[PDB]
Write a protein that binds this ligand. Structure first.
Ligand SMILES: [Zn+2]
Ligand SMILES: [Zn+2]
Ligand SMILES: [Zn+2]
Ligand SMILES: [Zn+2]
Ligand SMILES: [Zn+2]
Ligand SMILES: [Zn+2]
Lengths: 89, 78, 53, 89
């Protein structure tokens, strides 16, 4: 051949049990509102209700894990203190 | 740390821990090519393993056709 | 491959100035001996004889 | 064939994390002076500044590990008492 690849340096990202089909706290979907929102509108009044990203690469609706930070703290799908390394998908 | 505090600065220490994780996983996978290496598509590979929220969203993770020796390398790594 | 798979951590640098070997030659089959110095020259002779410096 | 090898008895040497590209104490290179020397000359005045070799097969600039022996004892990349099994590369 005329051009042959010798080296490569991809960077491979990884995700924990974010469950893109079901938030593990309320069980609705990674997106598509939560149990404490249901209707898209439901008097949105600014604020938000997107997705929260932890340091342990787990994902839930911002609302669900914010209200779960009262029941406990260590992210439910492991035993590491839940962090907020992101906001939104 | 000796200025803003231990807030958005401890986020950089987490990113350096991520760098450590990536280099370690890379060397481990080069070692396991010795055990595997079924095809010769993994001649020289340098794969890095990072975390979603840790790094700024690179993009929407494009899915365009990839080169075959890289195809075999990515298949072995996966 | 074994030393990099099981005992990952060391680097097996290659050398020639140490060791020995038993070269099985072949009227009987007399086994010779090479101390890691004449192995390469004898192998090149096996691949093709009539060589020089 | 006329000559066939039956036995072999190579002896395989091994090296720990000597890092031939970077002394692990000061981070400059296995050779090429240290942080406490920088310039090749810098008033060499006899003495030295070569590569110290431990029993745990680790390598650093003789000076870096002699100065690290004022901070700790067990070789940095392990928990075995650092020895001086060699001097120079
Ligand atoms: Zn939820
Ligand atoms: Zn909500
Ligand atoms: Zn988690
Ligand atoms: Zn040094
Ligand atoms: Zn020095
Ligand atoms: Zn050591």
């Amino acid at each position: 051949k005329r051009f042959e690849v010798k080296k490569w340096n991809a960077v491979a990202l990884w995700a924990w049990d974010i469950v893109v089909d079901n938030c593990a706290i309320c069980r609705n979907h990674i997106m598509d509102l939560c149990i404490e929102c249901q209707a898209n509108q439901a008097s949105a009044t600014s604020e938000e209700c997107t997705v929260a990203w932890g340091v342990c690469n787990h994902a839930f609706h911002f609302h669900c894990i914010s209200r779960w930070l009262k029941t406990r703290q260590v992210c439910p799908l492991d035993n590491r203190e839940w962090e907020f390394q992101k906001y939104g998908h | 740390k000796t200025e803003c505090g231990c807030q958005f600065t401890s986020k950089l220490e987490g990113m350096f821990r991520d760098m450590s994780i990536s280099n370690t996983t890379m060397d481990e996978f080069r070692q396991h090519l010795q055990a595997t290496g079924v095809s010769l598509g993994g001649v020289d590979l340098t794969v890095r393993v990072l975390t979603t929220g840790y790094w700024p969203t690179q993009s929407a993770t494009p899915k365009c056709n990839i080169p075959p020796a890289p195809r075999h390398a990515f298949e072995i790594f996966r | 491959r074994f030393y990099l798979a099981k005992h990952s951590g060391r680097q097996l640098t290659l050398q020639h100035h140490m060791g020995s070997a038993d070269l099985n030659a072949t009227t009987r089959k007399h086994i010779l001996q090479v101390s890691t110095f004449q192995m390469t020259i004898l192998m090149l002779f096996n691949n093709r004889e009539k060589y020089t410096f």
